[PDB]
Amino acid sequence: QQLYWSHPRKFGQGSRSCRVCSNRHGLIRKYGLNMCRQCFRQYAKDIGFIKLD
Amino acid sequence: VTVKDVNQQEFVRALAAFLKKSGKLKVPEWVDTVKLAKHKELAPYDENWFYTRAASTARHLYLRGGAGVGSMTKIYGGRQRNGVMPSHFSRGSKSVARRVLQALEGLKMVEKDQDWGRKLTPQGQRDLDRIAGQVAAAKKK
Amino acid sequence: TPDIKLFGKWSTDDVQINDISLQDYIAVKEKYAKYLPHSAGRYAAKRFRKAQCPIVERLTNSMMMHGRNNGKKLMTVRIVKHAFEIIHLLTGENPLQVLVNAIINSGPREDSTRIGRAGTVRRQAVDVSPLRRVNQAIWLLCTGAREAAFRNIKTIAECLADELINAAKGSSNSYAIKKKDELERVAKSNR
Amino acid sequence: RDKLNNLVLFDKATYDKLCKEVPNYKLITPAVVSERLKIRGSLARAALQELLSKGLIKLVSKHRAQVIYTRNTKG
Amino acid sequence: PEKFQHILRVLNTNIDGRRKIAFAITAIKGVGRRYAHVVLRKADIDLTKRAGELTEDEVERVITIMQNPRQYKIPDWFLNRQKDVKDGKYSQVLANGLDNKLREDLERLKKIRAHRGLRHFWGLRVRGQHTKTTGRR
Amino acid sequence: VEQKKKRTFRKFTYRGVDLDQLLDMSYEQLMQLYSARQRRRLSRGLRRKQHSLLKRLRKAKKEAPPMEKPEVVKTHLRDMIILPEMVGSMVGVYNGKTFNQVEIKPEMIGHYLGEFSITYKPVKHGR
RNA sequence: AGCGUGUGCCUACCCUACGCCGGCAGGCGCGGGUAACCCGUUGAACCCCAUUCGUGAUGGGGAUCGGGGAUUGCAAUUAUUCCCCAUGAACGAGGAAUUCCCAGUAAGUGCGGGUCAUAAGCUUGCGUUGAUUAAGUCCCUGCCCUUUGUACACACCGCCCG
């Protein structure tokens, strides 16, 4: 109703976050994972990203 | 000689001249003004050069299944000096190459190929092979 | 090619390192003639191996110096091939022999080391190994040619020929020859 | 120093100097002509290609980058 | 071969004659290299030579083309002043006249008091650049 | 601004076009000429929307006496392009904290409002 | 040439060959591709080469500025960026200092990925071209090995006399 309350959110840092934690900073957007790097570090084992070299 | 037989510089040099004698190629009225590539420093010293490119292209197509202007722009495209920034590719003009492609058609050297890209014609294939021989024949040296 | 394995077109046979001791880190080809001053060349792993490397190529490598010129061997090979031709025009001979001679003549026999010496550090006259003599010579000549060529119209191939020829018979016109005499003169005092 | 200023057009007498000298030198390139005369470098060049006429001078390599010429073909 | 001139004047600038034409011309304000190169090609000259060489003829011919470039198959995009504004020109300003128009343009937006104008007036910068660390000396 | 000489006498042609002619078209036919950045902005702006503003301009143009300047019209639209419709008006042009007041001379044409309201402050090294 | 990359997506959107117009920048019409299928035999760039220039801050260099074209976005003014012209700077080899490095290594050289709507001088790999040079040692520096000295132990960046 309140026509008041939004301006474009389509693109840029402001258009996205961490599916894990809201953070709009340092975001992994490759392969559609969309996790912030800090989180991705903590969840890379359960996603299937494993250290080899 | 197959055109493949003759060295690229002499082949192109001989054919380009042959085209010049023939007198009928056709030429965006410009060609005086044009650089040939944004990358380019100055236009071509040989204002006569339109012929050389044409020869170069005809030879370029004969070699390969089919080619189009974008490829040529890049082929002609050299490195461009960003100035402060490091140098990068910049595919060379599209008007010249296109006009070259259109003009060649007029002579029938090349014809639209199937699935995009211009291909050499048998008429051209014959023509290039013929000059190729003349060049081979000239001399040893 | 099949008769004898010449250089670009120059014969390896009959070139003699006119200088005992040096004999042998100057590598012509007590069988090794090739064709081109370019090779895959793995010299680095061992300490010695470099000696195996043809002196010509060794000279060519030293040619490509200065940050911009690094890795331009094709350019050096081209320069070297031209230089040999200029040298040949200038005195007949084997320019390769001319090259070898310049190298033999330039290596500082004696040198100096900065011995600690207490205070007013004095410098100790020591004799110099043949590997060093070869290594140092090729530098000297290359640095000589490169230094001369830079503000002058003349090309490295030409300046190289001039440095090589003057050195082959030590004219002392050469930068390198003057440098070697300087290094040696220093060696003698100190002692 | 080395400030170089060059005569960039033919002066007759300098045309004579060219054909009556250059047979003297064993080595001639752009630079030689430039230093020993006071030729442009640009007008050095044109003098080289001309000299190779039917030559005063003889080609042994004109690598893109460099001509390298010898004395004419004497005794 | 032949000789003459050293030292020739075109329209109000002194042009070294020893120099190659294309390059020689580029002393003139407003004649950059891409300019002068295309002007000469238009003007029929043996490209192969020295400004000091050539004829009084060829010279007027260069100048005539230089100040009416459009009228010679020189495209407008090649030009210094497209879209004038004050007249909606196209133009290619030349010689003393470039300094002139430069002055005008700066004045224009100083009259109007636009921030760029102001910047030029204090003798800072007008493109968006940081002014904290550089252009200090 | 109507009759022989009276008021008139500042001239200014924009792009070969004259202000007499300028003041009489449609903003359409003006942006058509040459400006290119301003024209794209208004097209894309478009739909267009400083609508009310433009009516606020004409309004205060009316209520202004008969000789001079008058009261002004405020705005935050820095990205607006000056077009002949505007010229002669008075614009309060915000810069972040201040609204600078500026009459738009015909010269400005094709320029952006923001170019006449400086944000930053010169500065200081000594002082 | 090589590592790599893509749309049909947590909510708005892809990589793009090919025809045409335009000097360019770019515009415009198509058609394939969940890809080892297509873009892309990644026909890269250095480089190699036939010319010009000619040792002049010149054609080395591309700063700053002016005008102008276009692209992204609703919005670019405080230039996102790109181009075209013009204006054509310092810099002609770097003192005190000081980093890093042993073989595909140093160095030249382009490309792709991340950021991303747009935007690379960045980072982050990758192939290409490819040397000089120790082949060792503990001098300086740094850290741990004994032996030794220590009023130190928040440990020398520590705690002694008037």
CATH of the domain at E14: 1.10.8.50
Q: Do E3 and D8 touch (CB under 8 A)?
A: no
Residue F56's H or E segment, with its range, is: helix F51-63
Distance, in Å, from the CA atom of D70 to the CA atom of D67, rounded to the nearest integer, reads 10
User: In this structure, are E10 and E52 located in the same domain?
Assistant: yes
Question: Across chain E, which distance is largest between two alpha carbons, in Å?
Answer: 59
Question: CA D54 → CA A41, C92, D48, D58, distances in Å?
Answer: 78, 25, 12, 9
Q: Residue D65 corresponds to which tokens in the numbers above?
A: 């980058």
CATH of the domain at A20: 4.10.830.10
What DSSP letter does each residue of chain C carry, written as one string?
--SS--SSS---TT---SSTTTBTTBB--TTT--S-S------SSSSSGGGGSBHHHHHHHHHS-SGGGTT-HHHHHHHHHHHHHHHHHHH-S-HHHHHHHHHHHHS-SEEEE----SSS---EEEE--HHHHHHHHHHHHHHHHHHHHTTSSS-HHHHHHHHHHHHHTT-S-SHHHHHHHHHHHHHHTT-
Name the residue facing E50 among D8, D11, D15 (closest C-beta). D8
Quick one: tokens of C129?
């190994």
F116 touches chain E (CB under 8 A): yes
Determine the distance between C178 (CA) and G136 (C1') in angstroms.
Answer: 31
3-class state of residue F32 by DSSP: coil
Torsion sign over Cα C20, C21, C27, C31: positive
Distance to chain B for E50, nearest Cα, Å: 16
For residue F19, give the 3-state DSSP assignment.
helix
Check residue A14 and report its DSSP letter: G
Cross-chain CB nearest to E42 (options B29, B32, B35): B32
Specify whether the backbone of A39 is left (phi greater than 0), alpha (psi in -120 to 50) or beta: alpha
The annotation status of A21 as a binding-site residue, yes or no, is yes
Number of domains in chain D: 1
Q: Is residue F4 part of a domain?
A: no
E49 and E98 share one domain: no
Q: What's the burial of C15, exposed, middle or buried (CB within 10 Å: 0-12/13-18/19+)?
A: buried
What method did the depositors use to determine the structure?
A: X-ray
Q: With contact defined as beta carbons under 8 Å apart, do C41 and C53 qualify? A: yes
Resolution in A: 7.0
Q: Provide the CA F54 distance to its chain's centre, in angstroms.
A: 10
Q: Is the CB of B16 under 7 A from strand G?
A: no
Measure E18 CA to nearest chain D CA, in Å.
Answer: 7
CB proximity under 8 Å: C 56-115 to D: 78, 82, 85-86, 89-90
Q: What gap in Å lies between CA C107 and CA D62, rounded to an integer?
A: 34
Residue B111, SS3? strand
Which residue among C89, C90, C154 sits closest to D31, beta carbon to beta carbon? C154
Cα–Cα–Cα angle for C4, C8, C14, rounded to 5 degrees: 50
Rg (CA), chain C: 17
Residue E83 and residue E71 share a domain: no
Q: Which nucleotide is nearest to A29 (CA to C1')?
A: G114
Residue B72 contacts by C-beta under 8 Å, 6 or more apart in sequence? B57, B60, B92, B97, B100
What are residue B111's phi and psi, to 5 degrees?
-145, 155
Range of the domain at F50: 9-127
Nucleotide nearest to B101 (CA to C1'): G19
Q: Does C1 touch chain D (CB under 8 A)?
A: no
Helix (H) or strand (E) holding F74: strand F73-75
For every residue of C100-142, DSSP letters joined together read HHHHHHHS-SEEEE----SSS---EEEE--HHHHHHHHHHHHH
| Domain C6-189 class, CATH top level | mainly alpha
Range of the domain at D25: 4-73
∠ Cα F9 F12 F18 (to 5°): 105
Residue that is written with structure tokens 């073909």 in the block: D73
Domain of residue A15: give its range.
Answer: 1-53
Range of the domain at E111: 76-137
Q: Are residues E62 and E28 in the same domain?
A: yes
Query: Per the structure, how many domains does chain E have?
Result: 2
Residue type, B66: G
Q: Is B7 (CB) below 7 Å from strand G?
A: no
Q: Which amino acid is at E81?
A: R
